[PDB]
Design an enzyme around this catalytic site. Structure first.
Site, PDB file in Angstrom:
ATOM      1  CB  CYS A 108       5.582  93.316  82.257  1.00 43.56           C
ATOM      2  SG  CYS A 108       5.479  94.682  83.452  1.00 43.56           S
ATOM      3  NE  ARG A 111       1.215  93.364  81.215  1.00 43.46           N
ATOM      4  CZ  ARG A 111       1.349  91.597  80.735  1.00 43.46           C
ATOM      5  NH1 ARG A 111       0.822  92.168  79.793  1.00 43.46           N
ATOM      6  NH2 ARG A 111       0.514  90.325  80.417  1.00 43.46           N
ATOM      7  CD1 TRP A 280       7.260  98.199  92.805  1.00 44.10           C
ATOM      8  CD2 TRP A 280       6.851 100.691  92.405  1.00 44.10           C
ATOM      9  NE1 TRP A 280       5.920  98.367  92.673  1.00 44.10           N
ATOM     10  CE2 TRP A 280       5.975  99.823  92.111  1.00 44.10           C
ATOM     11  CE3 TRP A 280       7.057 101.200  91.652  1.00 44.10           C
ATOM     12  CZ2 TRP A 280       4.725 100.289  91.765  1.00 44.10           C
ATOM     13  CZ3 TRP A 280       5.917 102.127  91.483  1.00 44.10           C
ATOM     14  CH2 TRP A 280       4.431 101.226  91.389  1.00 44.10           C
ATOM     15  CD  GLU A 285      12.032  91.622  89.514  1.00 40.16           C
ATOM     16  OE1 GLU A 285      13.030  91.959  88.657  1.00 40.16           O
ATOM     17  OE2 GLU A 285      11.352  92.623  90.317  1.00 40.16           O
TER      18      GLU A 285
END
Ligand code: HEM
Ligand code: HEM
Ligand SMILES: Cc1cc(N)nc(C[C@@H]2CNC[C@@H]2OCCN[C@H]2C[C@@H]2c2cccc(F)c2)c1
Ligand SMILES: Cc1cc(N)nc(C[C@@H]2CNC[C@@H]2OCCN[C@H]2C[C@@H]2c2cccc(F)c2)c1
Ligand SMILES: C[C@H](O)[C@H](O)[C@H]1CNc2nc(N)[nH]c(=O)c2N1
Ligand SMILES: C[C@H](O)[C@H](O)[C@H]1CNc2nc(N)[nH]c(=O)c2N1
Ligand SMILES: [Zn+2]
Lengths: 411, 407
Positions: A108, A111, A280, A285
């Site tokens: 991730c 973070r 979000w 992506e």
């Protein structure tokens, strides 16, 4: 023991001691690295150590390690395990646990935000209709009219593994995929199989390119049930380009709320098999993966056609050109509509600052380079140049098999 | 013990068995993955030699044959009495080709069997090394129609008589730190440039000055030589659409020639083994031109394109990056100098991986290096699981000699 990581752009060297607290295995050995492999009921015996490790961590974090409250809680959990064979988390422990599973999620990039997570405790939930209501509330809270807020909703933990809570959707909001007789796909090819399940279960498919799928929700090991998310709760963004006026007529849109619903949250040896969470989007992506993977919307050709790029040779870099323009459009569109999004430059710079902070205050930050480096413009982001150590800390989010493969159908 | 790798775009699954022949360590443990870390006697030599000769005799379909056992015996005897041994020419060629084949970080290995091997084991002096290297440079360059080659200087003995090329590549540009406080030329070579100067080089003090070779023969102090300018094929960088692009005054050299690695074959160590192929365009346009610690030209280019540089979310860096890379490819192609784009190279590598899986039982590969530094997920390697492990013969990184050497 100490392990060093170097940043090849800045020459900054960091020292990891946190890897010493790592329990689970990586898939790698002395003889093989599985860094690029996507996927490399407990006894009382295995459970009390795991509970104890967790409570020790929790009580340290609140600066009460070894206190009477700490010792009493250890005793109480011990007795609960021996007698009922599991245990229940206090609310403050559940919150700490879910924040830490995020903090520990090595794949991730987002973070830096870990300590700001709204935890919705749904452990009193008993039915799929109750799951539906919890998930709507989550979506509405997280969406917040475009000012997105990170959140997670936590349904009852695993018991015998026969009564599991599960969200069968891989994300709360996703588009249907429809495989046509000619072999072409209408909509999102990633969701074809799940779409067929929905249909089989009685969903009336509109059969367009961006049909928001229904929730398929399993409570207490029962057969799952279909629900439609109220369309007024599903924030979407039509995609247009700041310079190219033909971009809108491609007919693209995407949803604002990325909400992972298929992972398993482990806290202190307890397993929360339904724990949808949301943050979000990072622009890439949608613009890189969802739109341009060959196995997803696959719009590179059509965009490059309309840009009149030379397409007869890969060396013109037409694909690369079209890719950047599509990503510009996603970011422009979200920003223009006041829907939270982060570009890959900002997100990676923030991640590097988060990671250095974590090294100083925590002694490390497990990170999976393969996943943290964005899928376009890799080396112009500072994470490309940063050495990372990947290791597994608990509390944690883990992958689980899709439920249609394992579910015992009741009828 | 038998492992699967999946391609997530194509669903094709391959089974890896070749990894069970791996020997050296990865740096990873069951508890920690070091996949992103850049650098993670008579008795010791005979098993290494045996392991190698066995694979060699297998490759020529003569395993367990009289000729096989005879060579094993001859090599054993030679080690027992001399504390080392000499490779036959055929073995040397096989070993070099296989060190390339085994190079897990190399995307270009579809080419591995077409490597011209220049045996320079008879070399005794630095002037002799210069001669061999100029010949390598000229052969490999081939007027722009590049040909893969390696030149192999004598093996390590007691390790105080090492042959080394001090240069990290045969052809690179000097870097000089300025009174201005900035860097002129390539910042990656500031240290090597000063060492060149302190050994006598007269630097032209420019942005693109081809460095001299610093050659060390037989563990002696290294000596300076300028490569004949006419052997160094360089390319001026222009753009097919943007006329202003030529005015940045950018150029790059045609021949990527790695010269600081160590070739290990059958336990023998070749500390000077310069090798060369041809460029994938991203190496120059993404890494050499746009790394912050390199020529770092993104800002100048973005400005000439008049992009919005006020916010990162305009993707001005990303737009300029693509254009720079279009220019590198266009320029090399126009001047008929071999280059490969990242789409073509990665497509070929997937094909090579599939050949290696069916023919050899696997292909060690380092995903972190194989996926290009731009546009990762629109190349097929991004979606390909790879297993990384160490096979010998191998190329290994070795420390810069100026730390080791005593003058
Ligand atoms: C707040 C903004 C966030 C951003 C920008 C962000 C960004 C990302 C991205 C880009 C990925 C890789 C996704 C992919 O390629 O499929 C990812 C993975 C992940 N993130 Fe985040 N993230 C955010 C919030 C969160 C939250 C709230 C949680 C949990 C509470 C979380 C936990 C995870 C986990 C467990 C993964 C691995 C997913 C997998 O294995 O499929 N993240 N993040
Ligand atoms: C024929 C054209 C070739 C292409 C297109 C190519 C491509 C590449 C690329 C892009 C890299 C990464 C370089 C970097 O990022 O610094 C690389 C690495 C490497 N290649 Fe190749 N290669 C070629 C030929 C060769 C040859 C002829 C050899 C050996 C005889 C070789 C052995 C290696 C090794 C050992 C590495 C890792 C270098 C290091 O660790 O610094 N390659 N290759
Ligand atoms: C085999 C497999 C394993 C695994 N661990 N995850 C996946 C899911 C794979 C991994 N990349 C594609 C697919 O995910 C699409 C969903 N992306 C959402 C996570 C991103 C996101 C972004 C921002 C905030 C969030 F909360 C979440 C597949
Ligand atoms: C610390 C460190 C370790 C290591 N193994 N390599 C390096 C060298 C670092 C790693 N990426 C940048 C720098 O190399 C630039 C050299 N590029 C030439 C190799 C590429 C090339 C390309 C095509 C054909 C070839 F024969 C060779 C540094
Ligand atoms: C095979 C490889 O591990 C796989 O394609 C990975 C690479 N990196 C990724 N990185 C992110 N963020 N998300 C992904 O789905 C992947 N996929
Ligand atoms: C830290 C990280 O390993 C490092 O930046 C790597 C990443 N991938 C790379 N890939 C290639 N081909 N060349 C490189 O120099 C690097 N650098
Ligand atoms: Zn590893």
């Amino acid at each position: 023991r100490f392990l060093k990581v170097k940043n090849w752009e800045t020459d900054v060297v960091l020292t990891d001691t946190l890897h010493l607290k790592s329990t689970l295995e990586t898939g790698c050995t002395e003889h093989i690295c599985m860094g690029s492999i996507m996927l490399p009921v407990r006894t009382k015996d295995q459970l009390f150590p795991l509970a104890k490790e967790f409570l020790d961590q929790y009580y340290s974090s609140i600066k009460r390690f070894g206190s009477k409250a700490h010792m009493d809680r250890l005793e109480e959990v011990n007795k609960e395990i021996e007698s009922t064979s599991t245990y229940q988390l206090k609310d403050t422990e559940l919150i700490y646990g879910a924040k830490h599973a995020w903090r520990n999620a090595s794949r991730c990039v987002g973070r830096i935000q870990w300590s700001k997570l709204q935890v919705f405790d749904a452990r009193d939930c008993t039915t799929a209709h109750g799951m539906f209501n919890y998930i709507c509330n989550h979506v509405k809270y997280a969406t917040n009219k475009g000012n997105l807020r990170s959140a997670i909703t936590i349904f009852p933990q695993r018991t015998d593994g026969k009564h599991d809570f599960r969200v069968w959707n891989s994300q709360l909001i996703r588009y249907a995929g429809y495989k046509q007789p000619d072999g072409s796909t209408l909509g999102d090819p990633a969701n074809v199989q799940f779409t067929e399940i929905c249909i089989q279960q009685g969903w009336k498919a509109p059969r367009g390119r961006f049909d928001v799928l229904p929730l398929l929700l399993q409570a207490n090991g029962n057969d799952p049930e279909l629900f439609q998310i109220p369309p007024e709760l599903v924030l979407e963004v039509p995609i247009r380009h700041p310079k190219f006026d033909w971009f809108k007529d491609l007919g693209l849109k995407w949803y604002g709320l990325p909400a992972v619903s298929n992972m398993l949250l482990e806290i202190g040896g307890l397993e929360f098999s339904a724990c949808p969470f949301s943050g979000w989007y990072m622009g890439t992506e949608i613009g890189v993966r969802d739109y341009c993977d060959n196995s997803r919307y696959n719009i590179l050709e059509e965009v490059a056609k309309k840009m009149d790029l030379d397409m007869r040779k890969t060396s013109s870099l037409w694909k690369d050109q079209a890719l950047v323009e599509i990503n510009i459009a996603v970011l422009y569109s979200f920003q223009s509509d006041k829907v939270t999004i982060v570009d890959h430059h900002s997100a990676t710079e923030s991640f590097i600052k988060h990671m250095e902070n974590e090294y100083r205050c925590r002694g490390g930050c497990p990170a999976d380079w393969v996943w943290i480096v964005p899928p376009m413009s890799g080396s112009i982001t500072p994470v490309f140049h940063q050495e990372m150590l990947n290791y597994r800390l608990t509390p944690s989010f883990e992958y689980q098999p899709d439920p249609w493969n394992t579910h015992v159908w009741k009828g």
